[PDB]
Amino acid sequence: IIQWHGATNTRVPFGIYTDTANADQEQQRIYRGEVWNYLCLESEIPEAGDFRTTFAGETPIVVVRDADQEIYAFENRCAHRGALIALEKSGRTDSFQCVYHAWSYNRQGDLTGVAFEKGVKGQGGMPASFCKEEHGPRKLRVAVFCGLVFGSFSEDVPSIEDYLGPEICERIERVLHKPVEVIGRFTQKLPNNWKLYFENVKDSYHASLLHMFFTTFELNRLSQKGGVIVDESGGHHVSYSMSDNERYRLKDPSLLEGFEEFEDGVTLQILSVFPGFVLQQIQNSIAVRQLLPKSISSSELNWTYLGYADDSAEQRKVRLKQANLIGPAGFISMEDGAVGGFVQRGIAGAANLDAVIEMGGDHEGSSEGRATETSVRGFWKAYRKHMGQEMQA
Amino acid sequence: IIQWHGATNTRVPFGIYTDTANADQEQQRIYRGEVWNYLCLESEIPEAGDFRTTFAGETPIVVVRDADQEIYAFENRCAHRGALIALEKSGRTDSFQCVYHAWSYNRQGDLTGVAFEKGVKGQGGMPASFCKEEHGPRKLRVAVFCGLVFGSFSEDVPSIEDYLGPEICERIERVLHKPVEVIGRFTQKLPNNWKLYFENVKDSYHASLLHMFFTTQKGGVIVDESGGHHVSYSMRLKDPSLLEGFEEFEDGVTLQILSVFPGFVLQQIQNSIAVRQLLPKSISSSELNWTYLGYADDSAEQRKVRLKQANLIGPAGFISMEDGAVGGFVQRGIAGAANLDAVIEMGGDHEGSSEGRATETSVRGFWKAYRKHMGQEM
Amino acid sequence: SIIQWHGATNTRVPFGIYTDTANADQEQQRIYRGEVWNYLCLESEIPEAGDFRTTFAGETPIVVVRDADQEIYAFENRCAHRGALIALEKSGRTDSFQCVYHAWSYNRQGDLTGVAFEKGVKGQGGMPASFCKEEHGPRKLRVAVFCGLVFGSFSEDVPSIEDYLGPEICERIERVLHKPVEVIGRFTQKLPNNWKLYFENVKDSYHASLLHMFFTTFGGVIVDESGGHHVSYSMRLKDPSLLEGFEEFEDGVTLQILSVFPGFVLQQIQNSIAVRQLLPKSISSSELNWTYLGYADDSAEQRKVRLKQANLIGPAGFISMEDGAVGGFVQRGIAGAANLDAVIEMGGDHEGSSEGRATETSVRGFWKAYRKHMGQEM
Amino acid sequence: IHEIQIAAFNAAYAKTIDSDVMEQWPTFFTKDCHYRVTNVDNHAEGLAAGIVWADSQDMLTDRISALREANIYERHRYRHILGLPSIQSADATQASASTPFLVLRIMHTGETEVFASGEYHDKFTTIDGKLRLQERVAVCDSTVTDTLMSLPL
Amino acid sequence: IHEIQIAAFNAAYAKTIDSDVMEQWPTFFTKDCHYRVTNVDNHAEGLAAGIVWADSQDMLTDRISALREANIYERHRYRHILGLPSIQSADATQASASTPFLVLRIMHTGETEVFASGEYHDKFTTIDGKLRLQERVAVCDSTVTDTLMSLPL
Amino acid sequence: MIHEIQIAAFNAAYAKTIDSDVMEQWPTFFTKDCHYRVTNVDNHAEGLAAGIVWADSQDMLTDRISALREANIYERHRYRHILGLPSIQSADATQASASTPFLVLRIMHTGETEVFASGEYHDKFTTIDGKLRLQERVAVCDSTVTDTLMSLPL
Numbered sequence A: 001i002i003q004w005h006g007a008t009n010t011r012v013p014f015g016i017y018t019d020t021a022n023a024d025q026e027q028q029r030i031y032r033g034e035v036w037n038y039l040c041l042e043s044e045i046p047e048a049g050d051f052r053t054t055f056a057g058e059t060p061i062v063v064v065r066d067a068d069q070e071i072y073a074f075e076n077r078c079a080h081r082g083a084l085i086a087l088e089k090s091g092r093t094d095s096f097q098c099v100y101h102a103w104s105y106n107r108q109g110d111l112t113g114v115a116f117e118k119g120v121k122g123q124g125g126m127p128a129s130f131c132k133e134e135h136g137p138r139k140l141r142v143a144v145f146c147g148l149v150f151g152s153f154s155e156d157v158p159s160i161e162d163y164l165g166p167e168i169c170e171r172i173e174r175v176l177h178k179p180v181e182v183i184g185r186f187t188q189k190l191p192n193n194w195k196l197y198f199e200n201v202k203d204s205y206h207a208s209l210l211h212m213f214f215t216t217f218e219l220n221r222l223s224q225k226g227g228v229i230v231d232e233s234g235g236h237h238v239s240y241s242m243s244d245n246e247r248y249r250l251k252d253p254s255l256l257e258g259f260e261e262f263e264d265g266v267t268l269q270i271l272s273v274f275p276g277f278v279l280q281q282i283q284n285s286i287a288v289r290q291l292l293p294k295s296i297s298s299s300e301l302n303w304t305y306l307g308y309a310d311d312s313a314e315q316r317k318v319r320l321k322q323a324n325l326i327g328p329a330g331f332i333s334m335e336d337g338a339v340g341g342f343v344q345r346g347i348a349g350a351a352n353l354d355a356v357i358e359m360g361g362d363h364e365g366s367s368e369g370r371a372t373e374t375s376v377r378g379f380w381k382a383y384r385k386h387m388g389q390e391m392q393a
Numbered sequence B: 001i002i003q004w005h006g007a008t009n010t011r012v013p014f015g016i017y018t019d020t021a022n023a024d025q026e027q028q029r030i031y032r033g034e035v036w037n038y039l040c041l042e043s044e045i046p047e048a049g050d051f052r053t054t055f056a057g058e059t060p061i062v063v064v065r066d067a068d069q070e071i072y073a074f075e076n077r078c079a080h081r082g083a084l085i086a087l088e089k090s091g092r093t094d095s096f097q098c099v100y101h102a103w104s105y106n107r108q109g110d111l112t113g114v115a116f117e118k119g120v121k122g123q124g125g126m127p128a129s130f131c132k133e134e135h136g137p138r139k140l141r142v143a144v145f146c147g148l149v150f151g152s153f154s155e156d157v158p159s160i161e162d163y164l165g166p167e168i169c170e171r172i173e174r175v176l177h178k179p180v181e182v183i184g185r186f187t188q189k190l191p192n193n194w195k196l197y198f199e200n201v202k203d204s205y206h207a208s209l210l211h212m213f214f215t216t217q218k219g220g221v222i223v224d225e226s227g228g229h230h231v232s233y234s235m236r237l238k239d240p241s242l243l244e245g246f247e248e249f250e251d252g253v254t255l256q257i258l259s260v261f262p263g264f265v266l267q268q269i270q271n272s273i274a275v276r277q278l279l280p281k282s283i284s285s286s287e288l289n290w291t292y293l294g295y296a297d298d299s300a301e302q303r304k305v306r307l308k309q310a311n312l313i314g315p316a317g318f319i320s321m322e323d324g325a326v327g328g329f330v331q332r333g334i335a336g337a338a339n340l341d342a343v344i345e346m347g348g349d350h351e352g353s354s355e356g357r358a359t360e361t362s363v364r365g366f367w368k369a370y371r372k373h374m375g376q377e378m
Numbered sequence C: 001s002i003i004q005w006h007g008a009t010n011t012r013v014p015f016g017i018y019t020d021t022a023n024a025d026q027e028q029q030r031i032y033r034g035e036v037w038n039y040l041c042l043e044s045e046i047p048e049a050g051d052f053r054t055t056f057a058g059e060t061p062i063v064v065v066r067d068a069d070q071e072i073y074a075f076e077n078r079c080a081h082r083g084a085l086i087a088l089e090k091s092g093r094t095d096s097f098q099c100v101y102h103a104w105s106y107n108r109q110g111d112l113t114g115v116a117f118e119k120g121v122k123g124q125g126g127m128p129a130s131f132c133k134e135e136h137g138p139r140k141l142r143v144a145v146f147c148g149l150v151f152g153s154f155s156e157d158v159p160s161i162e163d164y165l166g167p168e169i170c171e172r173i174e175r176v177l178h179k180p181v182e183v184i185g186r187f188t189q190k191l192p193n194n195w196k197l198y199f200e201n202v203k204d205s206y207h208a209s210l211l212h213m214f215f216t217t218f219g220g221v222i223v224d225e226s227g228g229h230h231v232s233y234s235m236r237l238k239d240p241s242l243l244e245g246f247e248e249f250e251d252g253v254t255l256q257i258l259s260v261f262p263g264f265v266l267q268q269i270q271n272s273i274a275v276r277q278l279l280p281k282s283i284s285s286s287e288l289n290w291t292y293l294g295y296a297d298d299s300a301e302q303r304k305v306r307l308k309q310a311n312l313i314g315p316a317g318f319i320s321m322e323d324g325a326v327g328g329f330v331q332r333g334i335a336g337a338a339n340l341d342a343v344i345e346m347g348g349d350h351e352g353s354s355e356g357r358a359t360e361t362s363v364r365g366f367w368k369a370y371r372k373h374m375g376q377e378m
Numbered sequence D, E: 001i002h003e004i005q006i007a008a009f010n011a012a013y014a015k016t017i018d019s020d021v022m023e024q025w026p027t028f029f030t031k032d033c034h035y036r037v038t039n040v041d042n043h044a045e046g047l048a049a050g051i052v053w054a055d056s057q058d059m060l061t062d063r064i065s066a067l068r069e070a071n072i073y074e075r076h077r078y079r080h081i082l083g084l085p086s087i088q089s090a091d092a093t094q095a096s097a098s099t100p101f102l103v104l105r106i107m108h109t110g111e112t113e114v115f116a117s118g119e120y121h122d123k124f125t126t127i128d129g130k131l132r133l134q135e136r137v138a139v140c141d142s143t144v145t146d147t148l149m150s151l152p153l
Numbered sequence F: 001m002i003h004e005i006q007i008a009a010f011n012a013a014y015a016k017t018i019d020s021d022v023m024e025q026w027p028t029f030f031t032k033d034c035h036y037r038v039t040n041v042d043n044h045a046e047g048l049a050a051g052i053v054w055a056d057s058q059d060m061l062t063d064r065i066s067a068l069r070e071a072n073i074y075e076r077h078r079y080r081h082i083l084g085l086p087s088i089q090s091a092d093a094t095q096a097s098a099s100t101p102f103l104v105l106r107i108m109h110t111g112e113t114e115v116f117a118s119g120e121y122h123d124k125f126t127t128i129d130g131k132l133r134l135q136e137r138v139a140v141c142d143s144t145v146t147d148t149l150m151s152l153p154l
């Protein structure tokens, strides 16, 4: 049914974007497997009891700051009959208590209380064989890296620094180097399979072809070196780009003027981490994105826009202006939203055929130049490894 | 998958609420098996030719009064090419006639006319091997009990009386003792598999836990022999007339909730009387049809009391609003847990009548009847 | 099993054929992308070099385009790189097609013409030396044009259009499309049913004066060789200018409705001329695209006649409105009956004409063609 | 003629259709009116056909007659939600105006959907007392109609 | 006492519910008010029951209290889109009118649906200067409520 | 004095400009020095400043419309706005603080209609040479979700 052409990722079967049994396996082997799922920023849950609800793949999750200053995460599912435990997007709690029969849970998600556990007036309640310690939602391992909070179902996933690898760690560190502040949340519903979007974000090939904004309004743009890094797993990547004045056939060029801040020269750094996290820096526009599967045919992109806690009002205003480049109405980003749906619909009659991904060769290693699909093939290397779909060469 | 842990109803596999192939078998083995499906009240079709269109499970039904008080029910499906026969929620008719090709049907669902059956000009028409007699929608057995009309596709289903059993029959009789009148209809669409609402109505355990209104009483539960049917009973507002009522029952029971597999509820809360019909719609949705009742003999002061008490029930019920959403929280909480099990052990594995709140006996009771109908006992 | 035929006869149709989603995938393979001709558009709608329209064959998106040699070409709307739709407009005019994703470009035949950065940029990246453009492109269709009707097929083996139509169909088409036509409106009607119920409907002479009561208030059919195609022929209003007409066909035929497997209709009802394209969408929904026509030679009075008669057709038509709904009556009447059969026994199957009022020979004809194509014969 | 007079006439027009007092709907038009239901694509290309096409009040009455007496369809209602009219030109007795609209359809069995939206393109005139339509063309945003269109917009 | 009068009351009624400043909702009614939410079916057959049924301002105050402090539901908001009212009769102080409404529900999670539509059947009085509802009956076009109704229409 | 009906006729011209895709006129509803932003109730409750669109000059608006015409790739589609009656917070003869409910439907060129956004505009109006002009418009959307992309402004 779901057959890869060969051992390379130069050919992807179009059926991988519409097969529902395959999508169920994604939930077991990816989302609840040996990966780290992006939950939220530490700064968004700073006081003891502060929690947010979100997802890992399809599975609802709660993430919460406890009184020892650590962050815990568990499955958002009551151990009695399955009810969501936490019903708010965010809030502040002592204990969690399921609304349905008042079972109680501490901030690690251990079951602490069962209504009428030992009966009322000597009648009913639980058998002796019911032990509260044997009954709770699944707990996630939690890792914090530069304020990014990630969760995993698996006791066997590598530590976060090892999962990420050295190249990715340093580049996360380069942007997330001092306190940040959330300045905006927006969600984009995508009309495609989650994978079309994650491929797209890795896809340096389309940067100056799909997105015409820069070429359209360019007058005096100084030219840049572009490259791609892929970690050894293949699952993670960074895309980067690096008179005196840039000039644009724009009535208000302020849109595009900013200030040096990275001591860097890198004007664009887009970083992805398997299976669904993005950190971006586009001049002074900083953001994180969380990508979640929703049905075989749709997914969700959750954006968190950032400034730095030390921003001056002027600097802030630069970020707020550059933000027009990104998000659902981004001068760049609006197009990333639609293009996966173009693929989802172009392949309607083609579930037996394959995508051709041959730019920059047949492997998944780092590369100078944008005219490569190495980071795309990279995604599928990590995908096929989690999924048990590798082939002998 | 939809694997039961063992013969116990202490563990229910979460997949039972999501597996579409199981749902199809529910349609064959429950709705069109040995059950009684609730259709409507006899007073809602009082005159010959009064009909209503409803469902048994997924299957559309016509229920209709004919001559001499007789009520009949059949599949709302033309025996020609399968068009709905009756297109109205309710009306009054001599004859059913299909709008497609003008086949007609009596009040019992027998085929009584085929357009151009004999041909026209001895051109075309049916072959001589064609007997109106041998073509018809499926007919349902009909049963009336204290005004409640029920329908079954099954010739082997026991009598309405044996199906309910004696306990349930008396508790039905208790509320439906004299003529009733419909004072309102509302439908509440539920964002869960039907089974979650049904377990919820039988779930005495949440009563005073989920519903934090009804505190700002001796309890107990009857379960029938099969497990399918159940009774729950109990015996700083600025305008507290919401809660003022009057004695009406010889017995001081102030709450009787009663369920009949696979989707019928009779409620008495104070002076608030209602019937509920639960219908599956998709794997993750269902529909609950409310009929609010008074008695024919209500005084004007009495009717008004029902009208204010209704604030407790229905889609915006101070109680019932919570019963609507809670199945949806289950449906969504288990999104990542199809291979795991609901833990249903309050009051052990007992599946019979009990006194007290701290049990889930009638919930397990529903699973015993369900696995019986579905052929999923171990 | 819900799709098991009852015999080699087409007098029984299994109701599961309208709901089984594996079977619908097979339809895509064996009908839409098999030995058929799918209607795309009129040649007059794409009259100049480079003019194109996007449409579907079955579920598969298509581009249909005029080139400089006066010829018309059609190819799958799928970029041979990663799958994006190529053309995103319903209609336009272009030199080359270019994918918006990574700017691969195609000629008006659908060959891949250009790969962005095939040889890298600044000598970095690009394709391997083994890559070859010639080896990648979307599936190209055969195109046939008959009396301005543009059809497309994916199959090398489909008969020529005239042979596919048969002689009787060809002349009935030639009778309506004899001089230049002009589009006078487009409307789409989404149908709440499986496509096959609509296509059966259009062939169903039996319903004509039963379902549609407009005429009593205020026959004859032919099937092709295949069964696939058919023809239906006919030889108190405050303002009766609605039905006022004029002679234009030198034969007195006042109604000619003609269908071409698996989803083209050409209709003439008095002076109301239209083409219909029927496209499947999901298992239980389809789409009916109406193209209202006039003759290029219409006078003003003639044209206004067409405009007025159009009140008979389309989504609000005095006839058509009932055609759009009746499919959904069948789709919903069979909800509990996936296991049962449509009964299609009316009229005899023979060489030549039949009286339309009392036969189902055209419907049976659809099923003979269908089973043939689907490999479902017995 | 001000926008709120047209708004007021629009309220009555909409109320008429929404409450299924359909026999009153023709009375809103002159004896020799044009009424048409169409969409933006047709409008854009100057195509003249309509889903409904009438050039007299009589034809509207007949359409309604047929709804009452002949046509078979499942019961459903509309809900019209109109915006403020825009006037392109107006006298003391005539106006060209457009009005944005949204029409929900609620099947008798309960389902509610956005059935149509767009703007009416109107020519208005004053007979005696109040406003009267000489032309109303409903230019619908969508080229798609779900199932059938039985009540006029 | 005309349309724009009523429309302006409605706007503030709607702003009240929509902006979750719900404590003030009951102040829109007289102390001896009638408030019912029903549907066209119930209304056509003269059936009196209400999804909500109140015959005093205080009863409404309690609904809002139950909503703030007692009842369990997932966070959501409403968005009212009202059409222009239409007057059956008016004097200087007392009015019968009806306003068409659409009410969208937006879950806190993001999903928007048409949740209810219909007309308000209204009885207005004056209470020194400012308009007040004697009676509002929200007559819904649909007999179906999705999941639950907690905020008033 | 600025009253509710000057604002509503202003809103109707605003909507008409977008719905009919005469988008070159949209920026002229605004002062040279305007603020325009598109946001959602959550950002507004928590005081967050970012916008899906964020403009502090008319020129910013014009630039947006130019990108729409010349640069950006998107499937064609239309909006239909349905506006309710404004209510005015503050007001004199030149200026008003005001709010107006909106519904925006998106209709794809292929036919689908969906409720695309709903909420309220939060306006600061001034008067230049006779009629209104927005010094500030903040579209506060009831939903945090945008379907696919937002191309046309609200």
Ligand code: FES
Residues within 6 Å of the ligand: A078, A079, A080, A081, A082, A083, A098, A099, A100, A101, A102, A103
């Ligand atoms: S489902 Fe949570 S306490 Fe019962």
Ligand code: FES
Residues within 6 Å of the ligand: B078, B079, B080, B081, B082, B083, B098, B099, B100, B101, B102, B103
């Ligand atoms: S389907 Fe009912 S008469 Fe033909």
Ligand code: FES
Residues within 6 Å of the ligand: C079, C080, C081, C082, C083, C084, C099, C100, C101, C102, C103, C104
């Ligand atoms: S998908 Fe068409 S160029 Fe890449």
Ligand SMILES: [Fe+2]
Residues within 6 Å of the ligand: A200, A206, A207, A210, A211, A332, A335, A336
């Ligand atoms: Fe991009």
Ligand SMILES: [Fe+2]
Residues within 6 Å of the ligand: B200, B206, B207, B210, B211, B322, B323
């Ligand atoms: Fe309850």
Ligand SMILES: [Fe+2]
Residues within 6 Å of the ligand: C207, C208, C211, C212, C319, C322, C323
């Ligand atoms: Fe017909």
